[PDB]
Amino acid sequence: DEAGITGTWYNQLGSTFIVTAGADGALTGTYESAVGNAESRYVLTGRYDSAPATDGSGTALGWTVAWKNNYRNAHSATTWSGQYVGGAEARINTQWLLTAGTTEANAWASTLVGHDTFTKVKP
Amino acid sequence: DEAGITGTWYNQLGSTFIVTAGADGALTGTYESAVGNAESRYVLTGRYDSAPATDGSGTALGWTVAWKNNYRNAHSATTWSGQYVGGAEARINTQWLLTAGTTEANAWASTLVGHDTFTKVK
Amino acid sequence: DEAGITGTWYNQLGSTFIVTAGADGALTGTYESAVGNAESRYVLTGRYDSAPATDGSGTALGWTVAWKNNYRNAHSATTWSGQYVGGAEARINTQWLLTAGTTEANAWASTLVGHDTFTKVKP
Amino acid sequence: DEAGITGTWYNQLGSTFIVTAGADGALTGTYESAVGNAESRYVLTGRYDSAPATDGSGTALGWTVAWKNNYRNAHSATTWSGQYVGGAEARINTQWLLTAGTTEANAWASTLVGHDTFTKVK
Ligand SMILES: [Fe+3]
Ligand SMILES: [Fe+3]
């Protein structure tokens, strides 16, 4: 939901995701990672299902961060894919792909995979 | 690589990715999938490294499609995470995650993973 | 970690992983899934690092289940890749890939990804 | 597909996968990687669907390598999950997860994902 997703989210690492959901299905915001080659806030953009099912299924969504801002450039990008689950203990359950720019000889080693769970309460 | 990425791309399935790269690192555009629960064009947004390394490595990028447009809603979203490699054989090499909305009981089964390679012809 | 890995483990879904670690780095056992329409026990085999680092690093391992037994055949296989953490909170943190047999036209839709955490306590 | 799968396979990196498929669903063999922290052959074990569908679907399978042999220990393991596709041009299409032993604080960064296609030729 628009005002379900909009706001501040924390994952299990202590990273902070501040997002605004548009009526169209846009997500826009900033991300601050607690870990990795990262400092301060990075722009994010994504999309969500702006007319989800009302059968107790989650709301599908995804977003991207390119790890370039006015401090640092890690030459990498992370995408989170997952769903917003509402009601009590609201959460966004995600899996993510982090791709680093590599030479083609090393492209086999370009991409990390993991899982982040975001909650409304600070961990 | 604003000029390198901006344009039409095709993956191995015949899906069509039309993207504009902004100087600020933004990606915006439309995606049309050759497969799945998909009809016509869907909005995409993403981000790329607008100041890449100068050493021959690729340009990292990612984008999202939520599979809702004016025709159809599949209650799902896909993210592609990858890199742009330039030249005459320019390609975008990606891996993707497609999450469908599920109940919490079925959340273990929410997410498909695959790989798409996009090129400028075909 | 031969003694550490050997045992009965449960994940967050209530699945049961019974495994014996061999000195050679072998894992052998049975898996019972609580979800995904599996029935009874399936054979598993895998490998672990039989000489891990001593710095507090986890022990890397992986195993495979093909979802065929005497009762049922899902025409699929799951692999788990992860690490065993020792000491007080002994856990195996994994990500997994579940591939189903598909036609070539449908191969894009062959593979689910997820994450399982296994502990010796049943949830 | 016992004899379909049994034998020598090569991926796009020049790695070599030598495998024996048992009647009982077992896979056993050796793996030699062309890349990464790897020298000589490593033991693999896995499983495959020993009674696949007859509808033109591939045969599901998976295997594991822990990257420790007589020569080296990388403190990591890779699992490949995929399917064997027979007929005219035989291939094993896989995705893989490579997990390195890490501390708990660094476990976010433990796992690489990729895709390997193995063919009969080369
Ligand atoms: Fe690395
Ligand atoms: Fe499905």
Curated annotation (Swiss-Prot), chains A, C:
Gene Ontology terms: cellular component: extracellular region
Entry's Gene Ontology molecular function annotations: biotin binding
Motif Cell attachment site: where in chain: 47-49
Keywords: Biotin, Secreted, Signal
Residues where biotin binds: Y31, Y42, W80, W96, W108
Location in the cell: Secreted
Domain Avidin-like stretches: 2-123
UniProt record similarity statement: Belongs to the avidin/streptavidin family.
Subunit description: Homotetramer.
Function: The biological function of streptavidin is not known. Forms a strong non-covalent specific complex with biotin (one molecule of biotin per subunit of streptavidin).
Name used for this protein in its record: Streptavidin
Protein's organism: Streptomyces avidinii
